[PDB]
Amino acid sequence: DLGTENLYFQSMVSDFRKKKLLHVFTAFFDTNGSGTIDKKDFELAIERISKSRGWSAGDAQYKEVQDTLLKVWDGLSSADTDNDGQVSKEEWISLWEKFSSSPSDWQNLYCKFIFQLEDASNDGSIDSEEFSSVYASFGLDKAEAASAFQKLSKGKSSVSFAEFQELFKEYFASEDVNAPGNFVFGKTSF
């Protein structure tokens, strides 16, 4: 599929930003790897993310994942897509390219979802161990996630919810290859 390489998308987003945005599509949202996001991906994610944290249906935390992710899908699917209930990679780029000027509720809610998996006690901040534990549960290398935290945090011992939200915005927006927000999804390369 060369759609994402067409001149419209190259004028909208740099190659570097496009790679970052599509990484979130493939590594976090397109659970079955089909190349399109649909509700089935969220129904698989609910079960899999819950199990990755040691939860099972009937647990209060499972119900929280379920309710939150189904709300993220409700919002993501309410976008004007070619096919109802399916989100292409080309649609995804459009949805994230202006997150800094026009953030949508589903996008804020996903940011909160990840942060709240990490800050399980609601302290309002995360540390390296919590960050790396959650990305290890998502199947990423734990030591690389701890390295990512060091860069994300710019030396801080803990990162507040507001600082994480701003780092999340910087992941999608920044043109700088060393921007701290690049590291918010647990990797040190791009």
Residues of this chain that bind Ca ion (CB under 5 A): 30, 32, 34, 41
Residue 167 main-chain phi, psi, to 5 deg: -65, -40
Nearer to Ca ion (CB atom), residue 41 or residue 118: 41
Nearer to Ca ion (CB atom), residue 14 or residue 83: 83
Beta bridge partners of 160: 125
Q: Cβ 31 to Ca ion, closest distance in Å?
A: 6
Tokens in use for 32?
């079955």
State the residue number with the nearest CB to Ca ion.
Answer: 34
Q: How far, in Å, CA of 58 to CA of 103, rounded?
A: 33
Nearer to Ca ion (CB atom), residue 34 or residue 56: 34
Q: How far, in Å, CA of 104 to CA of 185, rounded?
A: 19
Q: Which amino acid is at 175?
A: E
Q: Cβ 134 to Ca ion, closest distance in Å?
A: 22
Neighbours of 70 (CB within 10 A): 13
Nearer to Ca ion (CB atom), residue 30 or residue 91: 30
Q: Cβ 29 to Ca ion, closest distance in Å?
A: 8
33 burial level (CB within 10 Å; 0-12, 13-18, 19+)? exposed
Q: Cβ 44 to Ca ion, closest distance in Å?
A: 9
